[PDB]
């Protein structure tokens, strides 16, 4: 196996925690959610691509076993791609007007809402460490290090 089953034994307990019947079973909508909560951070593309199918509107219908999600987790882990801290930091410097990593939070908000995986405003409102004073700055590097954990 690609991961220690002595800790997948803990993962089966973790799979039990969220709101469901249990019974050894998760829904495809939950497969991605658990992969976020426990696995390495997936894109929506990876959820649809790996051991699954992109034609998955009403993703609460399809259902997979804990011992099917664990193959999904392992197959993602051995095929995922990952950027380093410097890649995302430079991805912020590409916007940096100040050369010091202190652009106002409205820029980060606009980018996270507008591009890519289309995050909601309330999700960034959970993420944000700054405040809406007359300065409005969000520091790039330490707040990236605080987000990029696990």
């Amino acid at each position: 196996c690609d991961f220690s089953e002595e800790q997948t034994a803990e993962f089966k307990e973790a799979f039990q925690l969220f709101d469901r019947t249990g019974d050894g079973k998760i829904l495809y909508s939950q497969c991605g959610d658990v992969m976020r909560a426990l696995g390495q951070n997936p894109t929506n593309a990876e959820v649809m691509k790996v051991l699954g199918n992109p034609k998955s509107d009403e993703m609460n219908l399809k259902t997979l076993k804990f011992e099917q999600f664990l193959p999904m987790m392992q197959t993602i882990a051995k095929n995922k791609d990952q950027g380093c801290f410097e890649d995302y930091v430079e991805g912020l410097r590409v916007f940096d007007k100040e050369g010091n990593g202190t652009v106002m939070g409205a820029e980060i908000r606009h980018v996270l809402v507008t591009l890519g995986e289309k995050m909601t405003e309330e999700e960034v409102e959970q993420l944000v460490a700054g405040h809406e004073d007359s300065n409005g700055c969000i520091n790039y590097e330490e707040l990236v290090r605080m987000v990029l954990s696990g």
């Binding site: 106002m104 409205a106 007359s134 409005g136």
Partner: protein, 49 residues
């Protein structure tokens, strides 16, 4: 729009008025154009860093 704490400011309100005033004075109906300039103008808009 990018003045996330000072948007819709008053200077950007005045800029849109400066043209109608100088057009009310100045411009005229000639044969070729009903809002003929009758003067040349060069606007400079100044920006910060």
């Amino acid at each position: 729009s990018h003045k996330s704490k000072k948007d819709q400011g008053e200077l950007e309100r005045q800029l849109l008025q400066a043209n109608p005033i100088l057009e009310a004075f100045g411009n005229a109906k000639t044969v070729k154009n009903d809002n003929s300039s009758r003067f040349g103008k060069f606007i400079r808009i100044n920006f910060d860093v």
